[PDB]
Design a protein around this ligand. Structure first.
Ligand SMILES: COc1cccc2[nH]c3c(=O)[nH]cnc3c12
Ligand SMILES: [Mg+2]
Ligand SMILES: [Zn+2]
Length: 313
């Protein structure tokens, strides 16, 4: 109980900021995650032997892919940390526990291919779950790791609290399916704007947690330009492999995913910021005002992409 984790002074200060980068040192990421659970949750929330054994099984089960890797998991968990810390009293003891584990686990066993590629490939997972294919797999992998002897970090919860936390985690993970984000944000837009948004309404909470998950998942667009720019190389490395694999299935990929049409990337990112990112953190900022820095950074990076197209870098 008396064992805290601490960070070097630069990290200790930077980590509180939305635009924090977790750095190139893999071996320091679990300590960053544990630091965040303790500060976000309590030193009491989890038994450290169990949490450390969970984290290391979770790491082992992320693959060595260009973007959808262990570093993405820990980056997405840090954004959820930032949101929860700037919105202290809005979330339950349980929700804070659940949402940081859901973020760490949200892309478990990702191979770097869209749901769409699974369906055109006719992958067994597409027969097992017809929509949110990878997302239903990620949640399945989370429950598998939780069921490993010595890895049940929720052991000390009541029977009912346990079922609530796995339902928070199941909804959280499913909501990282971007095909579901469009409808979800539109319904949140209308509810906030007609003024019927009610945080005591569970069905409403779920919608708002889902937006947060999208917000955390896309948080590469909210970093300082040098980090956003270099992450975009990792993101596009996956898109180009997928487009190659579409070509092997006798299907010309959308020009975004095609590694012959790299010229089209900057306009690809405009559309993505204009149709996805800005709307996402706009709505997020209207429901949770203390998340405004994410909107501001996303606008800054949209501006940086405009400058790329205008041949100014
Ligand atoms: C995965 O989300 C992202 C995070 C950052 C930059 C991104 N660009 C695109 C894109 O062009 N299409 C779909 N997703 C993205 C994306
Ligand atoms: Mg995902
Ligand atoms: Zn993700």
């Amino acid at each position: 109980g008396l064992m805290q984790f601490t960070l070097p002074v630069r990290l200790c200060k930077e980590i509180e900021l939305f635009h924090f980068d977790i750095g190139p040192f893999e071996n320091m990421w679990p300590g960053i995650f544990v630091y965040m659970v303790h500060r976000s949750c309590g030193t009491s929330c989890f038994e450290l032997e169990k949490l450390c054994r969970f984290i290391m099984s979770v790491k082992k089960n992320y693959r060595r892919v260009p973007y959808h890797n262990w570093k993405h998991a820990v980056t997405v968990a840090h954004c959820m940390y930032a949101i929860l810390q700037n919105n202290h009293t809005l979330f339950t003891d349980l929700e804070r526990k659940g949402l940081l584990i859901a973020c760490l686990c949200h892309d478990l066993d990702h191979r770097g291919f869209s749901n769409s590629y699974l369906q055109k490939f006719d992958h067994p997972l597409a027969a097992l779950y017809s929509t949110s294919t990878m997302e239903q797999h990620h949640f399945s992998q989370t429950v598998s790791i939780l069921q490993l002897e010595g890895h049940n970090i929720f052991s000390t919860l009541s029977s009912s609290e346990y079922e609530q936390v796995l339902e928070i985690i199941r909804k959280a993970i499913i909501a990282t399916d971007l095909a579901l984000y469009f409808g979800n944000r539109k319904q949140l837009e209308e509810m906030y704007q007609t003024g019927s948004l009610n945080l005591n309404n569970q069905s409403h909470r779920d919608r708002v947690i889902g937006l947060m998950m999208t917000a955390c998942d896309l948080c590469s667009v909210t970093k300082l330009w040098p980090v956003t720019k270099l992450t975009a190389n990792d993101i596009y490395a996956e898109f180009w492999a997928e487009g190659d694999e579409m070509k092997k299935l006798g299907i010309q990929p959308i020009p975004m995913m095609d590694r012959d049409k790299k010229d089209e990337v900057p306009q690809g990112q405009l559309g993505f910021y204009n149709a996805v990112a800005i709307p996402c953190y706009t709505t997020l900022t209207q429901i949770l005002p203390p998340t405004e820095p994410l909107l501001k950074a996303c606008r800054d990076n949209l501006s940086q992409w405009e400058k790329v197209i205008r041949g100014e870098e």
